[PDB]
Design a binder for this molecule. Structure first.
Ligand SMILES: [Cl-]
Ligand SMILES: [Cl-]
Ligand SMILES: [Cl-]
Length: 163
């Protein structure tokens, strides 16, 4: 575990993270995809061997000794708000299990279902709260990666509010 487990946020490419493992915002088919998934495919392509996994699950594949946790959030274009919410919460619980099993002291994580799977809605708060629900009982340092300056501000505020 980390000596004083924390949450942090950084506005940069998760492919350049400084953590002991990465969560991919994966698709269910293990395809290179776009956004975070394409950056992860370019940086850790070896990790996409048999990475296909259902919605609401996480599947870890090593790239060397570096773990890539493929977490499949729902595409809210396809799911009802209710079912999508359930699967998004489930994906994060499976990430917490993996992070725990791997014994890492830190993990780089994107906000699942906030990009092309958002169904054109702002899901910062919905996705972040499910991340907290899952990760609060873990003792890894969590570093959340985002790309937008206003998202960085909002995530940083939500972290600081609970401290
Ligand atoms: Cl960057
Ligand atoms: Cl997404
Ligand atoms: Cl973002």
């Amino acid at each position: 575990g980390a000596m004083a487990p924390s949450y942090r946020v950084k506005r940069m490419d998760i492919a350049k993270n400084d953590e002991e493992c990465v969560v991919n915002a994966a698709n269910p088919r293990g395809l290179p995809g776009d956004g975070v998934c394409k950056a992860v495919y370019k940086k850790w392509p070896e990790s996409f061997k048999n990475s296909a996994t259902p919605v609401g699950t996480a599947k870890t594949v090593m790239c060397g000794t570096y773990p890539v946790i493929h977490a499949v959030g729902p595409n809210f274009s396809n799911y009802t708000e209710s079912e999508g919410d359930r699967e998004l919460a489930a994906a994060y619980r499976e990430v917490a299990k993996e992070v725990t099993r791997l014994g890492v002291n830190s993990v780089a994580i994107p906000l699942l279902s906030t990009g092309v799977y958002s169904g054109g809605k702002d899901r910062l708060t919905q996705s972040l709260n499910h991340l907290f629900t899952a990760m609060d009982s873990t003792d890894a340092d969590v570093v959340i990666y985002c790309r937008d300056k206003e998202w960085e501000k909002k995530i940083s505020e939500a972290i600081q509010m609970r401290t």
